[PDB]
Short mmCIF file of C-alpha atoms and ligand atoms in Angstrom, two decimals:
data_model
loop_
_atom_site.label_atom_id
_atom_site.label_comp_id
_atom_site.label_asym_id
_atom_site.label_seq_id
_atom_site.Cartn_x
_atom_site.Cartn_y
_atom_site.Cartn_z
CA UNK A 1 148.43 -37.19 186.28
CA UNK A 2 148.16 -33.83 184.60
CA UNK A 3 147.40 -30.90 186.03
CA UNK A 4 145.87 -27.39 184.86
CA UNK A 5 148.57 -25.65 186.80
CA UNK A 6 151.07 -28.36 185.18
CA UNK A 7 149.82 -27.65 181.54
CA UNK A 8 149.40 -23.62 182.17
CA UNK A 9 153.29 -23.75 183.52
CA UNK A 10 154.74 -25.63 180.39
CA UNK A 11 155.57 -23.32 177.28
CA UNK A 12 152.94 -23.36 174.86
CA UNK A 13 154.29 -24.53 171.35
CA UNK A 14 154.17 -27.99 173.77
CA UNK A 15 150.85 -27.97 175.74
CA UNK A 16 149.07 -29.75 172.75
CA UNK A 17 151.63 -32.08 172.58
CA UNK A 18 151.65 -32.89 176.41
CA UNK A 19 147.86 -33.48 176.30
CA UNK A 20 147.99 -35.80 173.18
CA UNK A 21 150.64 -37.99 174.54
CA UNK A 22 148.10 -38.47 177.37
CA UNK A 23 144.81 -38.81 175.57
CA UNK A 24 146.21 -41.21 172.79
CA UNK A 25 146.81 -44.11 174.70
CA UNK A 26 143.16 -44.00 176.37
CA UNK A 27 141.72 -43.21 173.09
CA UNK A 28 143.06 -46.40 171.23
CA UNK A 29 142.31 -48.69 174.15
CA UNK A 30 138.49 -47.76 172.59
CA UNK A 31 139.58 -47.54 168.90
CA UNK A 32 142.73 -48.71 168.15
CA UNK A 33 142.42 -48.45 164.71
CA UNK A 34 140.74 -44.85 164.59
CA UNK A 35 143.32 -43.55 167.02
CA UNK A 36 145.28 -41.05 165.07
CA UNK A 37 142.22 -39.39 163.84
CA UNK A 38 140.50 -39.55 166.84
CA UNK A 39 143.10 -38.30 168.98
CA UNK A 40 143.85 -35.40 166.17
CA UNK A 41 140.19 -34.16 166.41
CA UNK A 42 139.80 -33.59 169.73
CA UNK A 43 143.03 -31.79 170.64
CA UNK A 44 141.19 -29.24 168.63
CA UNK A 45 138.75 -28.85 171.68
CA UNK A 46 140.08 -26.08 174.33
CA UNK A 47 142.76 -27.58 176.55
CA UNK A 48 140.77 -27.03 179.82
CA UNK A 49 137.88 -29.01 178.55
CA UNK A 50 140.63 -31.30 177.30
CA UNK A 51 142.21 -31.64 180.99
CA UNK A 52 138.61 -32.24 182.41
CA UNK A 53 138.18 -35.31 179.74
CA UNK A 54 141.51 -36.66 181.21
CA UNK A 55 140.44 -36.61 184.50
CA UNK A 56 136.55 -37.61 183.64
CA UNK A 57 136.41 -41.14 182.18
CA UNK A 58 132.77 -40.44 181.32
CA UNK A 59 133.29 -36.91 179.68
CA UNK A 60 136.03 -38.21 177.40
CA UNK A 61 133.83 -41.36 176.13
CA UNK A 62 131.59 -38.97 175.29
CA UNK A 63 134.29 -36.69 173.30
CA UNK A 64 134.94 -39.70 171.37
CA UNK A 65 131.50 -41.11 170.55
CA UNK A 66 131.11 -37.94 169.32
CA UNK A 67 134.22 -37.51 167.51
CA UNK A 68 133.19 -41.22 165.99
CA UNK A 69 129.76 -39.34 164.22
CA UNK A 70 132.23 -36.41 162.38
CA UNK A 71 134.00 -39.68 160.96
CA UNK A 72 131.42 -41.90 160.08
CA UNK A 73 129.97 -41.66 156.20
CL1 LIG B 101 138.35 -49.26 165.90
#
């Protein structure tokens, strides 16, 4: 499980990176087939709010309902 002292330790070219590797695989158990683009617009969010939507269930269903409206027509 990731941690903010875990992401603020790693270099940062690679703290989007760790936190998309993570968020992917939760994010296509909803959509698998708008995973990519899912996953892509909301490591754009602030990785601290990102961290809290790993470790809330409920806050990163929201992220993604959300992130559903940008890509619908
Ligand atoms: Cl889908």
């Amino acid at each position: 499980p990731l941690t903010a002292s875990m992401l603020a330790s790693a270099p940062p070219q690679e703290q989007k990176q760790m936190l998309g590797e993570r968020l992917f695989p939760l994010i296509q158990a909803m959509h698998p087939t708008l995973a990519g683009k899912i996953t892509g617009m909301l490591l754009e969010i602030d990785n601290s709010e990102l961290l809290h939507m790993l470790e809330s269930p409920e806050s990163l269903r929201s992220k993604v309902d959300e992130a559903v409206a940008v890509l619908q027509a």
